[PDB]
Symmetry: C3
Subunit: 252 residues, 3 copies
């Protein structure tokens, strides 16, 4: 009279984590979401979120850096328990994984090369056949480039630094990427780069991704988000990482 | 040692939809939530919601128009996968079906007959035993009439146009219905009708209804709502259908 | 057939257990004005009102199972009742064993101090000192808060609230830490001995129902119910009545 329900509880990935004593977290490099610093340790907003979640669960944390384009297959094949990697909740991804409630929000922005894109002042100036746009492979930045600049030539990169180097070198007109990356890079490299428009042109809820059939793990993650949101801690961390450069000299 | 969990995933109605290639949606006629255009094809706020959801799942959409009084039994016996019908989340209904998070909010309003309700300037003027009120059978409008005008005689109709026609004919004092229907009809027929009070006297979250034991389908629907809400799409659609009459030329 | 596991999960929900019994069994503990016995001998308060409307909207009777707070989660786990509706803060350590609804209320921590021992105190830091003795209820988030915000002070955990106040009045502790509005009530009650050194609250804690795990249908029902009564304004009206007025005072005496 209770077997099915008890078996569902036992098979939760939350129970797998508790038995192992370690939360295994899949993520990828996006500055300042997650990145290796000069001491060789991972830091960033997503790292702070994952480290606190592990601590509040009473377990150790282990990070499993993964190629972003293969991060969902890695979750599905059990390379880790959870994606904490600044993943936008999306209905195509949700076919394969389940999402928590949002713990952050992001929006898409654009940074441009001063010589190639001189005089460009509007989104539509980049939606032309002769314009080359760079974005990160497998991300919502690529999807936004296709949606808002469909006539542009889109060039995808599996590495964030390789994409910005193309822009610095004058090989593409713009990089499309989540704020605050475009604004930060325009301020970092004013000799080569500029920010044509302030603000953002998408609004994207960010959630944890976990494997399906696990309502108990979802309950735990959503309850955890609600508590640290009400505490003001997510706002504090969002401001530190995305609205200051106080962490800048931790990096190589 | 994970059969129960793997079987729950396989038995989700989300997987049933994906393998069929078609989302089957139950709904009923309420202008402008869902109604036939002059070609005989369905249009409205709820139709647009269902069409986007199906498209974002990668499937076709098939509408199953249903008598509202039997729409939950139809869901339970498998006539369709989901109710996208402007349904208020309610605890009695929740005994039989599960509800998504809200994708819309509505509120109750009243439109009155000028001759029978001459002088009725307040809501309490309609809470009298000599007053007759019409409402749609099986809706929260019928419940609202029972709660806020318990002394009045309630006349129920399974057809929206039949109810407003009784009001137009001077056979009832008022129709209780979700905004914007009362305001729209008072502006459409000022010779017969008037709106004694602006604004609404209920506030009702609107949710999808699906069959129980399906946490995976619930996760998908709620994550979808969060994405299209943040995009501003639900707001745009709510404004077009419920705050303008720009769609009237599609009807007749 | 082909839906066996799913149909069994539906049938094994505690929601169905409640509907078949015809009665909702609610675990709670006595905290004024969350839940308390009035002078007619009946339970009243914010949590009682929430539980009574939930039961009525479910179509069942309600039965309250008063339980000692430190043992309330073990009592839920062993089936002494169906649900905790007892002002319980959603917390990650508790969530290891039970599941939580979305929030139906929020609380924040406060503090009530002895006038003689804590004369001149006016900030949180004044109480964070080795000589300061602080009391908090065992097993509550007041104990966690005292540990976090007053780590240097000597912490006296208790489970007899009346005895803790007796010690605060005779000056055997400097302050009592507890969820607002209770410290303010104790201060506004005994203005000669006690006072309220800090205005407002220094935590923000979402409050949720707690239920046994593996029950996504019961969670859906509880969360949908909260959404409806929150939209109606009813929860905020009940929060105001119990926690921001004393209109209920003379039901007690
Ligand atoms: N949210 C993006 C990933 C992302 C995070 N930070 C970024 C910065 C730039 C480009 C992409 C990103 C996605 O889900 O696909
Ligand atoms: N929300 C109502 C249905 C509804 C939508 N639009 C309406 C207009 C008039 C009356 C009822 C309705 C319900 O759940 O019952
Ligand atoms: N929210 C507290 C319980 C509580 C409610 N009201 C209180 C008043 C005093 C002390 C504790 C409480 C907890 O979960 O631990």
């Amino acid at each position: 009279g209770k077997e099915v329900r008890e078996k569902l509880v036992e098979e939760s990935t939350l129970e797998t984590i508790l038995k192992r004593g370690v939360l295994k977290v899949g993520m990828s490099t996006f500055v300042p979401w997650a990145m290796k610093d000069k001491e060789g340790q991972l830091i960033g907003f997503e790292i702070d979120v994952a480290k606190r979640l592990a601590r509040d669960m009473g377990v150790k944390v282990q990070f499993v850096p993964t190629k972003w384009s293969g991060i969902i297959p890695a979750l599905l094949t059990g390379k880790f328990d959870i994606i904490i990697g600044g993943m936008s909740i999306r209905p195509d991804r949700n076919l394969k994984v389940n999402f928590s409630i949002p713990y952050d929000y992001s929006g898409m922005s654009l940074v441009a090369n001063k010589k190639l894109a001189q005089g460009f002042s509007r989104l539509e100036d980049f939606n032309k056949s002769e314009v080359l746009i760079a974005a990160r492979l497998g991300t919502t930045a690529a999807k936004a480039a296709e949606k808002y600049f469909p006539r542009a030539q889109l060039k995808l990169f599996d590495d964030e630094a390789q994409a910005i180097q193309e822009l610095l070198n004058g090989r593409v007109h713009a990089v499309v990427a989540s704020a605050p990356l475009p604004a930060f890079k325009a301020l970092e490299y004013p000799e080569q780069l500029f920010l044509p428009i302030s603000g953002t042109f998408t609004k994207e809820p960010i959630g944890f991704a976990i494997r399906k059939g696990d309502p108990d793990f979802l309950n735990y993650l959503n309850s955890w988000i609600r508590v640290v949101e009400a505490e003001g801690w997510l706002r504090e961390k969002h401001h530190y990482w995305f609205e200051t450069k106080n962490w800048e000299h931790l990096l190589k």
